[PDB]
């Protein structure tokens, strides 16, 4: 399968919260993971709050998944040690908590140490950069940084440095990533990423690599821009690794000012449409750009954000249907799958 075609991780996000996508219940999904991939990311159950039950740490459910991975030929990318969204904040992660810095330290020290030897790499900090599309509280930019509870408590971006240093100390063997989205657009956020990563390097922070989520559409952003954004980050350091962490590809672009090039019906791309064929080319050109500009020895992996289309967080988005992944609703490989094969094989 796909993983055989590369010497770096070829991964997939797996569900474990019930319903049809749940990896523990779906033998068909289990079989795809074993045959095609050699790494998993937990789609949800390694987020911050999932490390607790009531007031105590609780690793039961995440240990089950990490063990499943080890028994079925998968390494694990941990997602994520520090991330702002309130649906996954531990209760300690509040401006009302005088003990915040102590509880932050305890979180990273405990979680990183717990998974040592079982988890290959981590998203240490995810989504520290400001994004206008993603600022529901209206706090605004602090010179490109998101003013999350971590930023507010630490009074600035020093929480990022601390998270990396603590993760390194707790598990010296893990590869430590900074992860974000929209940084492949080669616009304002890419610039803010350069500033963020340069500051960490200047401070001697133990960052091992940068993750690009790569939640893209079929035609936007341009492959030239994706390629140049990656190049800009590769150029910051002779060793910094690059990982594509959450790749998926929407056929529909609701942001293009054109409502006549949208597939509006679930039947449109059930069998065949121009969009599925472009999606093949799109997966292919992105994997090719990754290979061309990320040197051998610095390729941290490529991961797709789920197994089959109905499992995708983007199966519906902006009130439209979509088909974002490598396998269809009946778990059959799509043209997208072949695009990855062709890229990885040259
Ligand atoms: Ca459109």
From Swiss-Prot:
Residues 17-343 form the GH10 domain. The keyword Hydrolase applies. GO terms for molecular function: cellulose binding; endo-1,4-beta-xylanase activity. One of its GO terms (biological process) is xylan catabolic process. It catalyses: Endohydrolysis of (1->4)-beta-D-xylosidic linkages in xylans. The active site is at 127 (proton donor), 246 (nucleophile). The keyword Chaperone does not apply. Its EC number is 3.2.1.8. Keywords: Carbohydrate metabolism, Disulfide bond, Glycosidase, Hydrolase, Polysaccharide degradation, Signal, Xylan degradation. Pathway: Glycan degradation; xylan degradation. Belongs to the glycosyl hydrolase 10 (cellulase F) family. This is Endo-1,4-beta-xylanase A. It comes from Cellvibrio japonicus (strain Ueda107). The chain holds residues 265 to 610 of 611 of the full protein.
């Amino acid at each position: 399968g796909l993983a055989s075609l590369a010497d770096f991780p070829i991964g997939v996000a797996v569900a474990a919260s019930g319903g049809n996508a749940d990896i523990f219940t779906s033998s068909a999904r289990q079989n795809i993971v074993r045959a095609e991939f050699n790494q998993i990311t937990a789609e949800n159950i390694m987020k911050m709050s999932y490390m607790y039950s009531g007031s105590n740490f609780s690793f039961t459910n995440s240990d089950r998944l990490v063990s499943w991975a080890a028994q079925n030929g998968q390494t694990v990318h941990g997602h994520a040690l520090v991330w702002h969204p309130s649906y996954q904040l531990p209760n300690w992660a509040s401006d009302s908590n005088a003990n915040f810095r102590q509880d932050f330290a305890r979180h990273i020290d405990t979680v990183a140490a717990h998974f040592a030897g079982q988890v290959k790499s981590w998203d240490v900090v995810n989504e520290a950069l400001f994004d206008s599309a993603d600022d529901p509280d209206g706090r605004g930019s602090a010179n490109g940084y998101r003013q999350s509870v971590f930023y507010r408590q630490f009074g600035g971006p020093e929480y990022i440095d601390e998270a990396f240093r603590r993760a390194r100390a707790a598990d010296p063997t893990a590869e430590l990533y900074y992860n974000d989205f929209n940084t492949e657009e080669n616009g304002a956020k890419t610039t803010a990423l350069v500033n963020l990563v340069q500051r960490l390097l200047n401070n001697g922070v133990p960052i091992d690599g940068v993750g690009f989520q790569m939640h893209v559409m079929n035609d936007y952003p341009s492959i030239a821009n994706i390629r140049q954004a990656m190049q800009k980050i590769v150029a910051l350091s002779p060793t910094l690794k690059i990982k594509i962490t959450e790749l998926d590809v929407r056929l529909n672009n609701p942001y293009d000012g054109n409502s006549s090039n949208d597939y509006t019906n679930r039947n449109d791309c059930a069998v065949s449409c121009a969009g599925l064929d472009r999606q093949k080319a799109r997966y292919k050109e992105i994997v090719q750009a990754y290979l061309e500009v990320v040197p051998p020895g610095r390729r941290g992996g490529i991961t797709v954000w789920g197994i089959a289309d109905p499992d995708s967080w983007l199966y519906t988005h902006q009130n439209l249907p979509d088909w974002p992944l490598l396998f269809n609703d009946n778990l059959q490989p799509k043209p997208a799958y072949q695009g990855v094969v062709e890229a990885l094989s040259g």
